């Protein structure tokens, strides 16, 4: 009774990772994008949760620049406006996968977030930049009464039996001890 893994994504840019990571209740593998017709897509579902496209947080400056037309994250917002605000998904829920945090964190210490838009006003940390991106993606939808939406900033780490990648919480508490201690 895993009801709806309506999966999609920007295929070989972040979504190769999600199609590699999606292998009383059981679940099927179905409908990654195929090119079926309306006789097969009459009801894609009964109005149940679509696990949303990947947003790799790295196409925000990696523009699909055939004419430097638009960065691909704004195209992602456009197709999100197509997907989420359809009347055929009236009472649904939407699970955001903000994917590939690592190079986003690597690039916030680089060329700033003017590449999204100059409406951005955060102080170029990871936290407020990701908060702004979450804020744009959530308030791109407006009604939120019958459709509640859940956002997930994943890391796409190697989740195996090694916790050297778990150093970040220890660095945070060490640096917080360093900031909290002062001269006297």
């Amino acid at each position: 009774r895993e009801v709806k893994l309506l999966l999609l994504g920007a295929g070989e840019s972040g979504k190769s990772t999600i199609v590699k990571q999606m292998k009383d209740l059981h679940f099927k593998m179905f409908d990654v994008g195929g090119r079926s017709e309306r006789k097969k897509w009459i009801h894609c579902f009964e109005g149940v949760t679509a696990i949303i496209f990947c947003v790799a947080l790295s196409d925000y400056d990696l523009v699909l620049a055939e004419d430097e037309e638009m960065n691909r994250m704004h195209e992602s917002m456009k197709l999100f406006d197509s997907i989420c605000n359809n009347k055929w998904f009236t009472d649904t829920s939407i699970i955001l996968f903000l994917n590939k945090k690592d190079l986003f964190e690597e690039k916030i210490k680089k060329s700033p977030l003017t590449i999204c838009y100059p409406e951005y006003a955060g102080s170029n940390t990871y936290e407020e930049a990701a908060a702004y991106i979450q804020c744009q993606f959530e308030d791109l939808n407006k009604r939120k009464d019958t459709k509640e939406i859940y956002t997930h900033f994943t890391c796409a780490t190697d989740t195996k039996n090694v916790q050297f990648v778990f150093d970040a919480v220890t660095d945070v508490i060490i640096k917080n001890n360093l900031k909290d201690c002062g001269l006297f």
Partner: protein
């Protein structure tokens, strides 16, 4: 003048009348006593005074009234600008031998006046907090050995607690900055042993294990800095495979450590004590963390299965006191969830009290998840926080508390709230409740939750049915395929 600048003592020190220049020092330091700020229009005068003072330092100091020069180099050391006029070789070594913490430049030492030890330890920690080349040199000049010897060796001594406080703070400031200092303190010194002996002498574990919940105020401070440096030693050198000679002192550290969570501090420090104690409990080895669910039992708190669990109820009360702060969560409620996870992940009969405290039999009221004000509605809302570590520890805390099953997890929390955890490591079609965990079918609820399509399979309670007032005109979503690529 009367409250003169460093410019006046600059042309006053060249007329080196000793009582007059110590009068100038003793009138300067009381004016600028504890002010952490300064003026900027006299900056090169302060730099030249610093050069003159380290000329006096590296040439050697007076027999008596040296505490005046120590007080002035402390009160000038608090400036941000005069770091490079202090961080030299012979200056640091002079401050070390007046601090009696150097490896060389030492006789069989005179019985030290503690005043110059306070001022010299203050000078050392001020000098290492700024000026990173002084940190590199204090690593290079090998200062940690006499510090470790001193903190180990007042098992039988009588020092003022300010001395031990600033000494431990210097040890912490060294170990928080140079990886060579912490790798020297952990392995080739085995300082965990002696620092835990200092932890005992701060605590004073005895029969009557805390009916007197007050712990003294200064002792909470030095024990707090002890817990700081003890976390600072073993954070990266954790070994998931250990031996009995290694892990025996670890288990002893745990057995004395369980006393720390129970008691209360003075003032409002009782939050900060646990706020570093649980951090120390974070990186301890998993196979010998089982003293929480194995302490002594008596008639104080009601137990669950042969063993008291009042430390776990104290951990849950600390979690409820520590959750609704929302400013800096990744440093406050990450190790608590990690400790409760690795407490519950290894032996069963603690997870039953944990389950009874965090997963009551759900009445399934007309509220959703994450909309109420309780434990479940706080932390499953926390499950989609924008920090990776808080989600990674809270979703694992609720994946262990559901005994690692694909049902009985979304039944309590919601696929819409835990699909990220399931996408991380959960979908394998392997069916792992780890065998030994309590396979009870009786998870039928109090108000007897309705059928599998009545409740939301991704969210909580019954809300409505979809109206769908439409006919014809299908196949709208056709834009994503040519832009995915």
């Amino acid at each position: 003048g009367e409250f003169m600048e460093p410019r006046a003592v600059a042309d006053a020190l060249e007329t080196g009348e000793e009582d007059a220049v110590t009068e100038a020092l003793r009138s300067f330091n009381r004016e600028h006593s504890q002010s952490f700020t300064f003026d900027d229009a006299q900056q090169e005068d302060r730099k030249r005074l610093a050069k003159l003072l380290v000329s006096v330092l590296e040439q050697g100091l007076s027999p008596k009234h040296r505490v005046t020069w120590l007080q002035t180099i402390r009160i000038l050391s608090r400036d941000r600008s005069c770091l490079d006029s202090f961080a030299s070789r012979q200056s640091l070594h002079a401050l070390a031998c007046y601090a009696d913490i150097a490896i060389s430049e030492e006789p069989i030492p005179q019985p030290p006046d503690m005043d110059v030890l306070l001022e010299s330890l203050k000078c050392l920690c001020n000098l290492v907090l700024s000026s990173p080349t002084a940190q590199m040199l204090a690593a290079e000049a090998r200062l940690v050995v006499r510090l470790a010897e001193r903190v180990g060796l007042y098992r039988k001594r009588s020092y003022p607690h300010e001395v031990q406080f600033f000494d431990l703070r210097l040890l912490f400031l060294l170990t928080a900055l140079r990886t060579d200092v912490r790798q020297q303190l952990f392995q080739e010194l085995h300082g965990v042993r002696l620092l835990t002996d200092a932890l005992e002498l701060t605590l004073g574990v005895a029969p009557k294990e805390n009916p007197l919940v007050i712990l003294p105020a200064q002792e909470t401070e030095r024990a707090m800095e002890i817990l700081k440096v003890l976390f600072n030693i073993t954070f990266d050198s954790v070994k998931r495979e250990v031996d009995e000679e290694d892990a025996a002192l670890y288990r002893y550290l745990g057995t004395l450590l369980r006393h720390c969570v129970m008691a209360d501090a003075a003032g409002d420090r009782t939050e900060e004590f646990h706020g570093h104690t649980v951090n120390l409990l974070g990186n301890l080895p998993l196979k010998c963390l089982d003293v929480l669910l194995a302490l002594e039992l008596h008639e104080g708190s009601l137990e669950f299965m042969g063993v008291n669990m009042d430390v776990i109820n104290a951990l849950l009360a600390f979690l409820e006191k520590r959750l609704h702060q929302t400013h800096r969560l990744k440093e406050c409620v990450a190790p608590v969830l990690s400790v409760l996870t690795e407490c519950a992940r290894m032996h069963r009969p603690a997870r039953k009290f944990l389950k009874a405290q965090v997963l009551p039999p759900l009445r399934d009221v007309r509220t959703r998840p994450e909309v109420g004000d309780l434990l479940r509605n706080k932390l499953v809302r926390l499950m989609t926080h924008l920090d990776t570590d808080v989600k990674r520890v809270a979703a694992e805390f609720l994946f262990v508390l559901c005994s690692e099953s694909v049902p009985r997890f979304i039944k309590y929390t919601g696929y819409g709230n835990a699909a990220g955890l399931l996408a991380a490591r959960g979908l394998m079609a392997g069916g792992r409740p780890e065998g030994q965990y309590s396979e009870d079918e009786d998870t039928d609820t109090e108000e007897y939750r309705e059928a599998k399509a009545s409740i939301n399979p991704v969210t909580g309670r019954v809300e409505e049915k979809p109206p769908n007032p439409m006919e014809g005109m299908t196949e709208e979503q056709k834009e994503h395929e040519a832009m995915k690529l």
